[PDB]
Each structure stands twice: as structure tokens, then as C-alpha cells.
Paper text:
Filaments in three conditions with (1) glutamate (P5CSGlu), (2) glutamate and ATPγS (P5CSGlu/ATPγS), and (3) glutamate, ATP, and NADPH (P5CSMix) were imaged in cryo-EM for single-particle analysis (SPA). Long and flexible filaments of P5CS were observed under all the three conditions. After 3D classification and 3D reconstruction, the electron density maps of the P5CSGlu, P5CSGlu/ATPγS, and P5CSMix filaments reached resolutions of 4.0 Å, 4.2 Å, and 3.6 Å, respectively. The addition of glutamate to the P5CS samples induces micron-scale filaments. Consistent with our previous study, glutamate (a substrate of P5CS) promotes the formation and maintenance of Drosophila P5CS filaments. P5CS filament structures in all the three states showed characteristics of double helix. In P5CSGlu, P5CSGlu/ATPγS, and P5CSMix filaments, neighboring GPR dimers interact with each other and form a helical structure. The interaction formed between F642-P644 of the contact loops in adjacent GPR domains, which appears as a CH/Pi interaction, is critical for the filamentation. In the P5CSGlu filament, no ligand binds to the GPR domain. In the P5CSGlu filament, the GK and GPR domains are likely in a stable conformational state, while vibration may occur in the GPR domain of P5CSGlu/ATPγS and P5CSMix filaments due to the binding of ligands. Although we solved the clear structure of the P5CSGlu filament, further research is needed to understand how the conformation of glutamate binding contributes to the extension of P5CS filaments.
The bifunctional enzyme Δ1-pyrroline-5-carboxylate synthase (P5CS) is vital to the synthesis of proline and ornithine, playing an essential role in human health and agriculture. The P5CS molecule contains two domains, GK and GPR, catalyzing the first and second steps in the biosynthesis of proline from glutamate. The GK domain catalyzes glutamate phosphorylation, and the GPR domain catalyzes the NADPH-dependent reduction of γ-glutamyl phosphate (G5P) to glutamate-γ-semialdehyde (GSA). Our results describe the assembly mechanism of P5CS filaments, in which the GK domain forms tetramer and the GPR domain forms dimer structure, and both domains form specific interaction interfaces.
Numbering used by the authors:
A (entry chain A): 174 to 211, 232 to 259
B (entry chain D), C (entry chain B): 45 to 124, 142 to 211, 232 to 275, 297 to 776
The structure:
Amino acid sequence: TKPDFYNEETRNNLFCTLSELISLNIVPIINTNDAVSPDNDSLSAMLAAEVQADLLILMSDVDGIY
Amino acid sequence: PTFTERSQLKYARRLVVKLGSAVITREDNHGLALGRLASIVEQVAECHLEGREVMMVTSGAVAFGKQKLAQELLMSLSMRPRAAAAVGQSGLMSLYDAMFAQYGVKIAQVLVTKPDFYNEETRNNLFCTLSELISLNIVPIINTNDAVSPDNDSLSAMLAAEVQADLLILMSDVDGIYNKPPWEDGAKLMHTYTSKVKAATWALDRGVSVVICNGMQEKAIKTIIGGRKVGTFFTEATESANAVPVEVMAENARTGSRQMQALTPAQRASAVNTLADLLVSREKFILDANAKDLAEAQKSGLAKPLLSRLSLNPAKLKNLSVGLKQIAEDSHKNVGRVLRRTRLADQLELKQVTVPIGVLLVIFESRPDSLPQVAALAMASANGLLLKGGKEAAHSNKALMELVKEALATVGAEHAVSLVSTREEISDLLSMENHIDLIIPRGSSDLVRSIQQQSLHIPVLGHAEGVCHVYIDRDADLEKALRIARDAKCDYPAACNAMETLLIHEDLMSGAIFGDVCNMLKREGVKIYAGPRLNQQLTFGPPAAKSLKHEYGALECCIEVVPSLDEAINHIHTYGSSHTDVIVTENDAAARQFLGSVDSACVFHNASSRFADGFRFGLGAEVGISTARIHARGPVGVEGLLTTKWILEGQDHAAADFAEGGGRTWLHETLPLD
Amino acid sequence: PTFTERSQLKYARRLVVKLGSAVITREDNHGLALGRLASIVEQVAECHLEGREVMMVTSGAVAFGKQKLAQELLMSLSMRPRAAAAVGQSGLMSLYDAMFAQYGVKIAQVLVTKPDFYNEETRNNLFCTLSELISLNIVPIINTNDAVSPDNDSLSAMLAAEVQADLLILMSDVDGIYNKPPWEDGAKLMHTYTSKVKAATWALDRGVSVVICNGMQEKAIKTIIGGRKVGTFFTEATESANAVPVEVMAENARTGSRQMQALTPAQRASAVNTLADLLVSREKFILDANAKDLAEAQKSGLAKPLLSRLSLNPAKLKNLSVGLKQIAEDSHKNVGRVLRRTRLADQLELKQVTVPIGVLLVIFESRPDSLPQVAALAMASANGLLLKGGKEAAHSNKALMELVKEALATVGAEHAVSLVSTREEISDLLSMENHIDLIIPRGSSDLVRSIQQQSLHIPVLGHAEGVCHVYIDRDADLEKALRIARDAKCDYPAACNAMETLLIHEDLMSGAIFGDVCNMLKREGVKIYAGPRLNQQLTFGPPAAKSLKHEYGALECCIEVVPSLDEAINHIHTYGSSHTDVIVTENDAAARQFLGSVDSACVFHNASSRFADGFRFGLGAEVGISTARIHARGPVGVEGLLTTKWILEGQDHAAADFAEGGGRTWLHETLPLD
Ligand SMILES: N[C@@H](CCC(=O)O)C(=O)O
Ligand SMILES: N[C@@H](CCC(=O)O)C(=O)O
Ligand SMILES: N[C@@H](CCC(=O)O)C(=O)O
């Protein structure tokens, strides 16, 4: 969830989980913990941020920006 | 909370399980022990299908993922934990889905963490999620968000807390809590209760009933929901003193036996005299008590056997009084009596004497008349005694108990007697050990049969079957046998010592005495069957016997005829319970033949089976009818409750002294025994 | 086939299971009983992981689909079978996939039908498919092509046939095959064997070993693969007569007991004389036999206790001969002896006499010296007898057995003796009933302990623990107790009757006698521990005792001191096994105190624990040391093998005759007993 990116200990934890995963040729599917939830795009963005990923693809319905 | 006893546990509407990390993983943490898990899910689906509300908290997903990879961990430990738990979380979820859906129930994964309980907005959120779920007949599985994790039991506890659930089940590996470390004398498994322990206190402090069972125990939930004494139950309700749980009873009784051990000379005698006097003096109270409890039984209308035997009249009390006075006057030299007097060598005087047994436990249905009888038996036999009747008579039992407690209080004054009321769970009672010696069931076949089937690793006096037998020989007077069997069956046909069979020489089919006795049984209205040989014999005659080892109790008596003495003997040994038999004849050659050949507990010659009464034998007041192959046969008086004890009073003797070195030889001179 | 006994079943390389349609569906055929199925898949995955080759044949898919729909069947039975089985086939397959893969094994559905076995081209095809599969470590599940179907057991049978598989397991609901319908006396569950029955014959005719177990029985495969006698095994190998499986032994012995019952007067006496003569006359044969078997044991080198006790010397044989002659001369009036002589009324002469027990079964480790001793006991006690030693001595046992069979053959001539060799599976042996009476273990703690833990619902003479105790009083002569305990421990310190403890008055810590006895034990090299109170007492002293209820056997003796007599008594009762104890003192007041208060099987006063030998008591030849609370205490001679039997010789008496109607009164005049 978004709060999980804000505290830093959980930042460490989740990043460790992700690194351990990717090291093992596994493609983790990253949903939000709906359970703890009152469109999840900021999530992906700041995710790539913490990961410092090469390229963020963001599919959608619209073809592009006019 | 509100619930106090395991009895209350059929009445909790909201439940929470939390499987332990050891009950599901096999003995590697490198796979999954499945059978246990299956048992768990089946029990849970059951309790839910009943209508109770359950929210599993399955610990230990790591094992699932660890097994599921098993290849990449391999190839990485040569070139290089939580992640395995994440992938296992997924897979395990699927597996639960399949299995639960096979009962039609649906489930839905839910992930939480301890911090998620601390902030209050998330408390609102998660509780809303749970309420919305439970409202929809879904069994949410509640794991921890490993992802956010550096044994998840506090979690379940405080979960139940926020939910304010009826009962928290907490399965585990250990069976329960002991008094002390197990490597220690006195590891009293503390079933109730006035780490896991802390968390349990905590949850109790949240007003929540907690229980900790053993996973490997079958049906553990269905077991524990029944109220069965298993695992460990927690409540400080501490309503009453309830002087003994079950056992300090037993130790006490041991103490009291040790006590009365030093009170032979007229002490127990005068004491039982006092008991008879209290019986004949304060009967008004106990009489009205039985009248009351009998009225209480009437509305129940249980069983004319019961509804007849729970009765009591001052005439019965006079009978009991005279029996007790008899026991008193004749119970003079039963204990401490020596049986051997021998000298092995100079100042080597062995002698073997009489000593009590210990902790006797009676069991019988509502028949308060026996209670003081067996109490007199105990007290004259100087050994302790417990009791357990049935449901009825309970108040009458208490009245008699107070009377006898007074009676023993006079001299010796120690209460080496008790009573285990309030549904002590007979099977659990006999599950005890190291205390109780002689189960003395007294009610009837059922009672004793249920006992023998339930009793394990404990001596059980008494029989269970009353298949007696009556042989008639070719040289036996006809009318003699006529009246004999007439009485044998028609004196108290529901007795134990009854002739649920009648065997006749092959020759005497000619004298139509078979017909005569059929006529007689008809006279008495006896539904007779026929033996296979007898089936062959006549045209259609009486109907065929169902099974030779059957029991009637009512006015029924199989009848069969065989060629020879020896054939009869063999049939007896084949079917007879070795309980009781009699022969009728005029040849003493055959008489002795039978006498020896037979192996019944007791055999007669021209008498009646109804003689097996002990009292009839001048054997004092009987206590039971034992058919076991040891120490006791049929009519057991008091001496069936006395063992021996070797004693020896040397001066300076030693073992190697009787070797070649010391001038110590052997005499074994049978001194005149006292 | 080739396999003959369940012993051979650790050596089958190709297996085939066929679950029954009742072991998996719950008790509705409207769902699925899962726990059983899980157990099955776990066992199967195990046997496969071992390296054996398995091909399940799961019956009963219909239940899966029936449950899975549960809605459309509902809505159609209001507006309107095989199809449900098809959809269930799919789902069930998936489920097996999940579960098996959780052990890492992979599977692959395979469908067949009975016609598919009949044409030969399809035989080729299917066999090719199966071989290709098994070659790839895959466990094919073999269902029938329901689609083409109008209980699929013939299928599995002939499947194994075409495969020519080692063993066909056929689980089911029934435990096994009986001699006859169960509603019938003699439902002998025929474990081996010289519908399912037919198909089993068939498969056997195809050279295939078949077994039919019970599904509900746990570990049934792991059980049956071990060779354990379970289910029903099938082979007509009929190699040897193997005169008794286990039981016709028992009945025979019963017959032989009945036989020797009529041979009291010097008959058994002269017979055991004959036995002693055969012992002293043909010893060369048995001596060389033991020499041979001892050499055989030497290469094994099992245990210096065993490797020492299996020995035998003609001196030992002389000892046995004199013991047997003693038993002979003194075993004159042990049986049939009357104990009571009483008259209830005119021609009412009850008397109670001595009778045997029945089928005694000894158990002991390799110690052929005891064998003839206990045989003499049996024969002088006129009751039957079985035997079971261990592994060694077996040939020696046979030699002794032949000698004694001769000895009994002389008079009476009936072989009321046997021997159960060839690994009769002691636990199964004691699982029997209705035949055996007295388990008489004789080896050592282990033996008897394993017994008591295994024995259920069967009398077991003997003890298991030798925790004795020695109290020393403040008024006891020092050197007296010195030599006393010296011997008590240092005569055969590995005995049962040993003082694995030593208790001392609190006062006598002052006279340094504690020090003196420590010195003495050192003299004898005894590793002494200390009691908690003693731990408190001195500076560091000897090390602390581990546990008070421990056992040493070797040169070890805990030592502890308490204040008072009564404290010692309580400690005894708390820890003592009530086996044996002695007091040393000069006060007889305290003497009697102890005497009474104590509850040991046997207690002494200034003697040695090593006196508990029975023979030492002039009690004839002992048979065991019993600590049970019934019928027998410690040294049990022969009379611990004699029960009683009420007999009664009336003329014309009846029950109601002693009622008010008939002039029959009560006397109970104690006639002078014979
Ligand atoms: N749940 C919102 C953000 C919640 C918040 O932190 O305001 C999202 O995923 O975009
Ligand atoms: N307080 C939690 C862990 C909190 C966390 O770091 O997530 C525990 O003791 O198990
Ligand atoms: N003969 C087979 C069925 C043959 C078939 O139609 O496939 C049976 O009796 O079960």
C-alpha cells in the first residue's frame, strides 16, 4: 500500500523482498493490500522510483496525450 | 468473558482457529504434513456448516513455498526466505480454496500485521472487511503480511480481541500445560487454569475464552466443543471450592486407609455399629429425601428397573441395619490375620499377614440401598473407598454420605470416603491410574459391559454375562428336575445367575420329559427356542434358537439335547461363560466326572442356580460376582478385598551369611500359624 | 507368483493400489471423505519416494462431480449420473495434481475400460503408454472411461495381470475375510488364505500376490509393507504343516490341562521325576546343543548379560535336577485341596477347592535354564503352558522341549506344552484373548516394561521396577547397618531386589556414619549421588542426584536423610514402588510403627533386601516377583497359580425352599476343613 512506501523500515523490508524475488527469475505481481484500503497509479510510479527501474510502462485505454 | 466450564462450549457462536506452525509442516519444515491439515479443514468445515462462525489463522506458509521452489533454492545455494513464503502464500491459498470448496464453502485470503491493529483507522477498515465477509458465509483465512515482516500468536489473540470472539481455539503440538517442566516429578497436566501462556492471559483479560489443544489429537475441535476434558482450558471464574477435582480425593482416601489401618480392635466394629444406629435412628430424613428424589425421577419416567430399584422403605432400612450388625459382629479378625508362620533359620521368622487393597471405586446405577452396604464393607475392610452412582438418588446418596461420614467421624474420624458427582465423566475417571485398584461395577450387564469395554490397564472385578447351564442326566428323577428347573428359571428370571439354557441327555427325549418341561414353561409363560439338534429332532416344534451365546433376561430359555456327558461338557466349555452350572443325576461316577471336568466359577449337584448369593453361603455380605480367572470366583465376600504382605523379623541376618561363609542353614520349619 | 510370506514384502519393486469407492466418499456418497484420501496419497507418495513403482486406481469419482454441481442437479430434480462422474473426473484429477505435486511427484490421468484389455492391439498400446510413463517417474492415475460405461475391481486385478506387478494392494472398507458370516460364532478373520475373493483368486492365478486391507486403518501400506499381520494375505504356497499358526496351540493346551486334571496322585509327581531323570541322563545332547548355539551367539556378540546367561554347565543341570526333585517331592497336595467345609442346612455341604488357572504364557530372554524350571511348575500345577524365549537358545529350547515332551508323554501323555518360535510378533501374541491368562515375563526390566506398555486387557504377573529402600534409625547399631547395607548393595548389585536408595535418620548425620558408609561405598566403588536435603547439608560433597525415581542397576546408590520416621514413610510412599524395604533399629515401638505404616510388597527388620528369593522363604521354587495389588505379592510360589472353585452337593434343595414355604433354615456351621 502507499503507506508501506512512507516508513523506511518497511521500505527496506519490501525492497529486500523484491530483490530476493527478482534474483530468482520470478515475476512478482504487485497488487495493493485492498484489505487496508478505503487509481493505484502513483503506487506504480513511486514503486519504480524506489526500485529505480529503467522504464515504466503504463498501459491504459487512451492512445496518448493531445 | 462469560463462559466458565467446558459444558458451556456448545453455545459459542463465533470461533477463531489458529493452526500452529508445527502441526502442518512435516518433520522437516521442508514440505507439508498433510493429513493433519486435512483433518483440521474437515473439522472446521463441519463447525461452520453447523452455523458457528470461524476465522482460521493458518501459520506457517514458508514450508509451502520452500517445497514449491526446491530447485532454484538448490541452484542458488551453490552460487549464493520471505520470498518463498510469499509464493507459498499464493499456492497455499489455492489449495485451501480447492479443499474448502469441496465442502461447498468459499474462502477469501486476508492479510494483516501487528501494526495494522495499532492504528485505529486501519482497525476500522479491517473490522469492516471482516464483518462484510462473515455476513456473506465466507471463511477468511488470515495470514500475516509477510511482505512486511522482518510466532504470530499474539496476532490471533488480539484478533479475537478486536472481534470479541466467543472462544479462541489455539491448536499446537503440545498436549497442554503441566504443573512443572516435564523432566520433573509432578508434571500435572493442568487442564483448567485459574509465550502462549501470556497471550492466553492477555486474551482472557480481553474477556475472551481461550483453549489450547494438541494438533495431533483427532477430532480435537469436535472433541473440545463437546466439553470433553482435553487440552487446556482457561478461566479464573473459581466459583466454588468443589473440594476435589478428582484426585486429592484419591490421595486422601489413601491417607484414610493408612489411618484406619491402626484401628482394628473393635474400632471399625464399634464404628459400623454406630453406622447401623445412625441408619435406624435418623431414617426420617433419608426417607423423605428418597421420597423427594423419587418424585423427581417420576416425571422423568426412565426405566421400570430403575423406577423400581430407586425405591426404599423403612423395611429395607431394617434389612440394611441387620445386615450391618451382622457384618459388624462377624468382621472381627479379617485384617492383619497371619497366614503362614515359618522359621528359615535361627531368628529368621517369616510370617505372611492380611492387609487391605487400597483405593476401591464402586460404580452402580441408582440403588442407594447398596451404598451403605458397600460402605460397611470398606470400613470393616479398613481400606479406602470412592463412590459413583448415576443420575438419580443423588440427594439420597448425599444423605447416606453424611450419615456415614458421621459414622466414621466417631473413631478414626478420617473421611476415607468420598463421592464423585456432577457427571465426572466415567471414562475419564477410569482413565486415571496409580490410585484406583478395584473397579467394582454393580449395576447390571450394561454397566459392567460398558466398563469392560472402556476399562484398560486397571483391575475390574465382576462379570458381564449370565449364561448359565443346566444338564439333566438319563438317571435323574423326572419330577425332581421338573421342580428344579421350574425354580431355576421362575424365581427371579431377570437375575444374573439364571439358566438361559437347559441341556438334556439324548436318551430322555424318549420319556417325553422334554414335553413335560415345555408344558411347565408354558405354565409359566416362557418363550422357548430350540437347539439345532432339537431343530432336527421334531416336526416343527418351538422356533429355532437365534444364537447359542445370546442372552434373554426375560421369560426365555433355549433348550437343546446332546448325546453324552462329554458332549455336554464340550458344549459348555464352548459357550458357557464358566459362570455357573448344575448337574442332576443319581450316578456319582458321572457326578465326579462332571465335577472335575467342569471349569465354571461354581458348579452344583441337585441344587438351584439361584443359590449363588454368597450370603446364602454364609459368606457374610457379598460384594460382587467375579468371573475373572484370578484372585476371585463368583461370590466374593470381604476376603476378596484382602491381599497379603510378607514380613520378616531377623536379628543380624544377611544374604551371604547363608552362603558357605556364615554358619546359616535352612529350616523352613512350618511354625503353627496363628 | 514368487512371494510367500509377509516377510517377503519389503522386496516388491512394482506396486498397484486400487482405492475402494467407500474409503474416499463420505458417509453420504454425496461429497468426499477427505482425511482418508489424504492419508492414502501420503502413504503412496512415500512408497514411491522410496523407489517402488506404484499405479493408483482410484475408484469413485461420481461423488466429486455430484458435490461439485449440487445446484443444477437441484434445479433439475424439480423440473426433470455419468455426466457428474465426468466432470468429477476432471476436478478430482486436478486435486490429485495439487496434492501429489506438493510432494514434488507428478502424475498423469489415464483412462481405460474392461474391453480395452480384451483386444490385443490396444493391449500393446496401453502397455506402451504405461511403460513410457513409469520410465519417467510419473504416477499414472487409472480411472475407467466412464464415458463408455453403462465395481471396477476386476479391472485393477487384470491390470496388475497385464503389468505382471509384484503385489496388488486392494484397500477397502472391510478389515479382512472371516471364516464365516460375521453374524455367526467362529468369524475367524482368515489373515492368510490358502467378488473380491474371486478376483483375488484370479490375480493369484496370474502369478500375482494380492492383499486386501482396511482403508480406515492408519499407515495401512506402511503397515502392510513391513510384513505386519493385517488385512488378508493370499498364497497357497502351503510350504509346511507349521503345526499351529498361533491358536490351536492354545486350545490344545486347554485340552491338556483338562487332561492332567485327572492325574493328581503321584502322576504328575512321577512325571516330573521322569523329567529330572531325562535331565540328568541325556544332558550330553542338550549340552552340545547349547555349546553350538552359544558359538552361534558369539559371532553376534549381543550383550554380556545375554552372552553370559545363555551359558550352561552340567553343574547348572545338577542344580536344575535337585530343584526339580524338590518340586516333585513337595508338590504333592497343591491341587484339588479344599479350603472351606461348611453346611448351610441339612444336606447342604458347600466346600471350596483348588483348581488350575489355564493357559499360562511365559516370556523371557535367552535363559534356557528357566525353561525346565517353569515347565516343572506347570506340570506340578496341572495347568497348560506356552513358551516364548528370544532369538538365541532356540535350538537349546527345542532340545529341552523334546526332553519335556517325552517326560509328559510317559503318563497323561498329552502335550499340554508348546513353543511359539519364528518371530511370532509378541505384540500380536498378546493381542490375543479368551485363551491366555497369565503373562509371566521373566527377562528383566526392559522385557517386563515393554510388556506392561504393550499389554492391554490381560493379566500380567510381575513387576518392572526395583526401587527398594533402606531406612536407618537413630537407635540402630552403626557397624550393623554398615555390614547390612554393604551386603544389600554389594551382593548382586544388578539385581531387582536392590537398594537403589538409602535413607538415614536426621540425627545420625552427627555420628559421621554417613561418612563411614561413603567410605564403604568407595571401598566397593559405588558412584553415590546426594539428596536435595543432603545437597543442602554439606559443602559440596557427592554430586546431586538426578531424579529420585531413577534406576541404576550398576554401582550407584542415591543417599538422602530426613528428620523423622513418618517423613521417611511419606517419602517411601511417594517414590517407593511398594516393592521391598527394611528397617534397622532397636526400638520395637518404632518397629511396629514401620511395620504397619509401610505398604511395600514385603518389609523386613534387620535383614537384607537380598532375602527376597522365595526359595529362601522355603516357598518352593519361585516363579516371579509380583507387585500388582491383587492375588500375589512379590515372591510367588506355585500357589500364585491356583484359583478356587465353589462346589456344592445338595440332595433335593431349591432356592424358594429356603424361603418361608419350605422348612429350610440356615446353619453355616464351619465344618472342619480338609
Ligand atoms: N489508496 C490511494 C492513496 C491513498 C493515500 O495515501 O492518500 C492510492 O493507491 O492511490
Ligand atoms: N511487533 C511485531 C512485528 C512488527 C513489525 O516489524 O512488523 C512482532 O513482534 O512480531
Ligand atoms: N464387461 C464390463 C463392461 C464392458 C463395457 O461395456 O465396457 C463390465 O461388466 O463391467
